[PDB]
Amino acid sequence: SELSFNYPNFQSVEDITFQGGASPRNETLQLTPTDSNGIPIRQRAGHAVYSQPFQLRDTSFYTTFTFVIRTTSNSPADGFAIFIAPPDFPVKRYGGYLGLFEPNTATNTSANKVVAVEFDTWVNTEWKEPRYRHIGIDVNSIVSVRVTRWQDKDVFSRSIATAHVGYDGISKILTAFVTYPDGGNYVLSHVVDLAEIFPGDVRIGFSGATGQYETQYIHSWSFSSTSTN
């Protein structure tokens, strides 16, 4: 179906739903909470989602957002993701599950219905993932189907980074491009039939989790979808 929105900043959150530890703060979406002293709270997850459902049958979309990772040590955890899931998808487990999975089914593709582009700051030993910080495409599992190295210089840059995520509904391909000002660029794509996974309605949004020593912020976001028919 056709949907468009545009948030150059979050002075308005009219159409954004916050769940778990996420909240609007300083004209941003703050995905995980901080205490009254500004310190990241450990072991929390949060979602900030566009409230209106849409359909993926015969649909292409383009979305872009800007983001900042604020770290308070060289060992931040856990990261954040942009995700698509059914409209009643709740905030799930904190830590390396990124708010998107739970321990007993996190690697079981038959037990999940969620697609995401993750920005992963903490190398988990509890399931397979690369030995370095990474950006990945996840299809129904916390073990990414496509994953690439995310350079530490960019992770810790303090920059406002940009992501572009697109889905071509004819070729059935999800793509992310991530760019840093005067830093790295990242390209990842995967063939996945989203309408097969999600025959009904979905929402798109962000999930963040701690972890420790990290807060994730979304500074702007826009989206457009169009019919392929």
Ligand SMILES: *[C@H]1O[C@H](CO)[C@H](O)[C@H](O)[C@H]1NC(C)=O
């Ligand atoms: C365990 O804690 C670290 C931080 O010390 C990370 O948050 C990691 O993801 C956690 N493990 C799991 C399985 O969530």
Ligand SMILES: [Ca+2]
């Ligand atoms: Ca990962």
Ligand SMILES: [Ca+2]
């Ligand atoms: Ca991880």
